[PDB]
Design a protein around this nucleic acid. Structure first.
Ligand SMILES: [Cl-]
Ligand SMILES: [Mg+2]
Lengths: 195, 197
DNA sequence: GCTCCGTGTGGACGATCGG
DNA sequence: CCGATCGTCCACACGGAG
């Protein structure tokens, strides 16, 4: 169906949901002890704390001041990576969409990524596995779902567009501007309430 | 490059001051209507000849016009892109509609196949691999160039939600969370954009 | 006239899933 | 048989130097 209540815009101005920002999404929570979020909702993989791959990447992440090209929960708090990627999506000339799809990766970034899916249970990286993040730089969606932070959905939506092969460079730039306009008031209102 | 976090962005005040140099309702830089007798197709500025007279286009147009629902496989020959955008946008806000599942796994009838094959034949034969730019990640969603030509950023919701729906990295509950995130973000934008235009 | 660089695009082909 | 995403590799433009 389609009414004049929709084409005029009044149906969207009255949008309300039963969820509360800052409250856990139904079924979402922290991973079991000694494990980190991975895969589908509620799933997890063993952590790689003390492993050479995780610790080498943790030091590089803490020393760069930039968002990590390959992120894992062993590297730090997901809120830091979410905020760095979110800010990156709003800085002009940053090439955020190109960086989300094809970031420059040192061998340590490759070794970290290979260790995470291997310790989960995978023999090789495969396009069919549900990981909870379409781009390796974006933290697992379960951390946004557990914290009830809908503004962290922007990182995943922008990365899903960036990772798609069906849009060219100029088309992705328009979609990034669309997402900037949509999420800017949400992020401003959400970051104020939870600070 | 490098990103500097600070209290201006952590408190949210950097996002409250967001402004861009674009104007809603005005063409995106480099974007415009297709040439006469052609429809938008492929990358930015590209186009293919229209099929407004072919039997495949007319069969699908009647099915679209007789259902009152958005077409599962859409082409410019079926009607106004703005109407299909509005139907998909309304569908994305409809409870119990299974919108993400429908975007990812639509029913494709023989008439849809004949329409889709007629569109690629009237263009050039580029396919020899699976990597090709279409301008829309889901066939039900009109070409992005129509949103770019009209400067309608609210029509980006249909493409952003469809890109999530087609991704293989999220399960059903994760895609449901992302739809709610996109609903909240775009609801004030759509309300404000539909009023001005 | 060839290469040499880094870097930024899209294509090619396969793995895996599924109608 | 068809085709979807996405890992992985690669083709090519960029241009002042030899
Ligand atoms: Cl709320
Ligand atoms: Mg066949």
């Amino acid at each position: 169906e389609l009414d004049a209540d929709a084409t005029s815009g009044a149906f969207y101005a009255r949008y309300r949901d039963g969820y509360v920002s800052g409250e856990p999404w139904p079924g979402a929570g922290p991973p079991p002890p000694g494990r980190v979020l991975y895969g589908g909702l509620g799933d997890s993989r063993p952590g790689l704390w003390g492993a050479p791959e995780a610790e080498e990447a943790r030091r590089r992440f803490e020393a760069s001041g930039a968002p990590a090209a390959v992120w894992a929960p062993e590297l730090g708090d997901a809120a830091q990576q979410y905020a760095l990627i979110t800010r990156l999506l709003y800085t002009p000339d940053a090439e955020a969409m190109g960086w989300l799809q094809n970031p420059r990766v040192v061998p340590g970034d490759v070794a970290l990524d290979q260790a995470c899916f291997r310790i989960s249970g995978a023999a090789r990286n495969s396009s069919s596995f549900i990981t909870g993040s379409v781009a390796r730089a974006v933290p697992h969606l379960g951390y946004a779902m557990a914290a009830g932070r809908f503004g962290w959905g922007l990182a995943h939506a922008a990365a899903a567009v960036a990772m798609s092969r069906r849009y060219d460079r100029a088309q992705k730039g328009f979609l990034l501007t669309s997402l900037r306009r949509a999420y800017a008031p949400l992020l401003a209102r959400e970051n104020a309430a939870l600070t």
